[PDB]
Amino acid sequence: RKVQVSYVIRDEVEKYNRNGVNALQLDPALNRLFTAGRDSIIRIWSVNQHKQDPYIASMEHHTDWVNDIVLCCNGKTLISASSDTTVKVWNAHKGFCMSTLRTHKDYVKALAYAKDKELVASAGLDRQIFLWDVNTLTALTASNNTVTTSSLSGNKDSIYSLAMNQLGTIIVSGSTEKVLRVWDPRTCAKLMKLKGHTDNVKALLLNRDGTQCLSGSSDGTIRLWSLGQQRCIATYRVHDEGVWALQVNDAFTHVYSGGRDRKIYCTDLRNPDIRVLICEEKAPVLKMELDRSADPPPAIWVATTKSTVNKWTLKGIHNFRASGITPLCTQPDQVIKGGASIIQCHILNDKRHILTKDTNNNVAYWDVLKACKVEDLGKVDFEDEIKKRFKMVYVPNWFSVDLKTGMLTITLDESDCFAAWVSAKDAGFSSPDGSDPKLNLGGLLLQALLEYWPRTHKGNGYFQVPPHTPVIFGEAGGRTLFRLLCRDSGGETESMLLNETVPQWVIDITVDKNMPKFXXXXXXXXXXXXXXXXXXXXXXXXXXXXXXXXXXXXXXXXXXXXXXXXXXXXXXXXXXXXXXXXXXXXXXXXXXXXXXXXXXXXXXXXXXX
Amino acid sequence: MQIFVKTLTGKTITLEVEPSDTIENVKAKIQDKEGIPPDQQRLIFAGKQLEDGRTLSDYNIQKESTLHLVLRLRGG
Amino acid sequence: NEHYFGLVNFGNTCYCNSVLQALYFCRPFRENVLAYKAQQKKKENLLTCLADLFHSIATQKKKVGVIPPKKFISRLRKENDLFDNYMQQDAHEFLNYLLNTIADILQEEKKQEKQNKPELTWVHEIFQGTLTNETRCLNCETVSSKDEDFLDLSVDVEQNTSITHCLRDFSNTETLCSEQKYYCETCCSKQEAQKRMRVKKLPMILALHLKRFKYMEQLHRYTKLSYRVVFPLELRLFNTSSDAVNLDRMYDLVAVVVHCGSGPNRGHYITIVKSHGFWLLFDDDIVEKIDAQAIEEFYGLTSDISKNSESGYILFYQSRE
Ligand SMILES: [Zn+2]
DSSP: OOEEEEEEEOOSOOOSBSSOEEEEEEETTTTEEEEEETTSOEEEEEOSSOOSOOEEEEEOOOSSOEEEEEEOSTTOOEEEEETTSOEEEEETTTTEEEEEEOOOSSOOOEEEEETTTTEEEEEOTTSOEEEEEHHHHHOSOOSSOOOOOEEEOOOOSOEEEEEEOTTSOOEEEEETTSSEEEEETTTTEEEEEEOOOSSOEEEEEEOTTSSEEEEEETTSEEEEEETTTTEEEEEEEOOSSOEEEEEEOTTSOEEEEEETTOEEEEEESSOTTOEEEEEEOSSOEEEEEEOOSSSSOSEEEEEESSSOEEEEEOTTHHHHHHOOOOOSOSSOSEEEOBOOOEEEEEEOSSTTEEEEEETTOOEEEEETTTTEEEEEEESOOHHHHHHHTOOOOOOOOOOEEEOTTSSEEEEEOTTTSSOOEEETTTTTOOOSSSOOOEEEHHHHHHHHHTTTOGGGOOOOSSOOOOTTOEEEEEESSSOEEEEEEGGGGGSHHHHHHHHHHSOHHHHHHHTSOOOOOOOOOOOOBOOSSOOOOOOOOOOTTSOSHHHHHHHHHHHHOOHHHHHHHHHHHSOOOOBTTBOOOTTSOHHHHHTTTTTTTSOTTOOBOOOOO | OEEEEEOTTSOEEEEEOOTTOBHHHHHHHHHHHHOOOGGGOEEEETTEEOOTTSBTTTTTOOTTOEEEEEOOOEEO | OOOEEEEOOOSSOHHHHHHHHHHHTSHHHHHHHHHHHHHOOOOOSHHHHHHHHHHHHHTOSSSEEEEOOHHHHHHHHHHOGGGSSSSOEEHHHHHHHHHHHHHHHHHHHHHHHTTOOOOOOHHHHHHOEEEEEEEEETTTOOEEEEEEEESSEEEOOOSSEEHHHHHHHHTSOEEEOGGGOEEETTTTEEEOEEEEEEEEEOOSEEEEEEOOEEEETTTTEEEEOOOOEEOOSEEEOOOOTTSSSOOOOEEEEEEEEEEESSSSSSOEEEEEEEETTEEEEEETTEEEEEOTTHHHHHSSOOSSOSTTOEEEEEEEEEEOO
């Protein structure tokens, strides 16, 4: 698998979630909340209720979505599951990564935890589930540990949900297989295969003893199951669409549910008739976490597709149950602020600038090469702005863009990274008073990204990238190899890791400075009426207009200045049956001549006048 | 943008393309996943066989489009 | 007023003759071609030549014989560099080229009758169907629907099956996962998704093209698939549509272009057609009546016990009228 260098255009600190929360985890001992972000960052908050800013810290090791989080070891020890295919163990009090399990092969979608037996399992699109002892991971002793990876087999389809009971005697998985699979974590023995659901199961819940199970699926139903009776015991149709998040009280009598329809409901499992509309969120519910300080729970924490996290009070259930649908809460008691997510982006024909639109509808102009914002256009019409800022030039694709963090992430690949060769003056890099060379954008950018790396000694000579710019090195298919900040390239152990992970295709150009040649283009040239066999050797780096002057030398059968005079009357190198501007690059003709319903070899028109 | 190709076994594969991408290039991308050389490949879309000289925009092949990959059975 | 005349092989043009024969016994196509011949624009192109050939076949004093498609082939070679040779070719590539070329000619004529939004020619009226592709993201479940036209369906095959089964697997839901994940515009990231292709608009004639080939990545070559694939004489299809009107139309098999040969690089094409209830075999210049039971069997060879594999490659189903 080939390796790709990528970086994120962002601020030094991203205090608020930039793409919504997938999973929630509350610590009652220290009154701290944990949000897992789609922006790949876990954040810690103080839910004391009285503080102008609850932001404590942010944990950034992951490079993709954080699907689930688990708070273990009687207080604080966060485990995370991510779409970067890795599982990370964190010292939750001090907030840093300890170990990274790279056992999973695909996105890691869910985690289950057995408090008592202090056990934890991880599953994803791997179709494989992995059991882990929290104590064994947290260990720093390594006294003949010989870590044995214990997997769970059976899952035919991709797993989206996992649940384990308190005692850790039962473990059930939910997948696109619609069927739930149960096992005994202590023995790894297959228990049963509960058939019943119509669709994928995204939420699973087990009782203390693991006797009965609650499940939520995209079929719109909540199913109660008895593992004793070994079959479904009940089905509640509460939502008018998929149900993705569930929480229960300690009694295991009242179930809390939400999903796509954005409505949050509490439902009495005993008497399904009793169904209270808690709220209607501003976006589909992705995950919920109850406040378990009191029974019944005083409040519920709600994570959605939006970056904002909300708390809704459940204190008044009892009074509404006896008397008299109309929802309980209209406004949240406490709101965790959210940032904006970039949902639309457009690369301009100059492949240096990017236009973006975000969830607040704010449009902004960006410079990929200098990895920074340039201007905030505000809530302007995005497609109209795109048109207005149209440049009639062509520059080959040299990078890709992703927005899965809600932030701009630019990715460079071995293939097309080096492809865009533009003049410096064009690139706005005036060099008074010598000449303008043909610079490679991807090259310069690579140099700037690894500017502080000593192996490349300096910079690129033209520009600098923000020193806090994260530089990620990763396999295209999935697995993340190494993430460091640009400024950190200096560190001896960092430079040692760059030495070990940075692939050869980058080494050739940044350190060894063996800059790549160009990849020439050619086209047929002849008179449109008369003149007195094959395309001449040419390049997109050529000014195109200068080649038309060479045609005037054949009619003749200090000279460089006389050839420029031919452009005033002769030459006339038209193409695609239309007039061709001398300032236009040879590469730009491919975006108009051959692009207009014709073969990639269009002949150049020529005339005496 | 992303388009789809239905391969010989009926398996669907994805391709990341641009409207300016030519058909030969697309066949090269198919070749990267399946290994079939472009000279052996034939692509049918919307009832029409795609020409190597033409581009995706020319055939108006937009996102989520499914292309049908087929090879050849020669006879005389 | 029926006739049965074979076509001369001009070296490796059996693929041509076979497709022309299959198309000739597609009555609405034949009829539209004859109606085209009657207007006499008197300019030469592939359609006028085709019309001349079909008219010559239909209007012959005897009932049986052999006709040389010299002028048609001359035009085919003239307007297409690709078939301008004596090499062996694919019947489906030819079929598709011919249908699109004629249809393009007709479009240009509609465009030039108005001269003194888009329209549809009779080629589309006969062979064109429409599919609806639906992709559902498993993360947010936002189903995305896209309509796409077709002139024929290319179906993947498996050992010891029926074309009805292949057709049903074709319309089965497929999960896009791992390296093939779908890019969801809501999730703004690649996700597992469910893909299903259902028939939205049924064609007058359903042409089925069997993907009888397999690529060996490790061996850098492909082989011909000579699997047994039974094709029934009749087929029933149901329509989706807007569910205001819902179809359940019956089709009958009328013709099969068959490829004979052990490999994909060489072979021979023949055509079987149904006429007034019995089956006939066209092998270039030779035509013979064959009994109905023998046509299942050789087409889709069992095991290996058969000389130079003769397998059905393109089938033509005619809607009941
Ligand atoms: Zn989605």
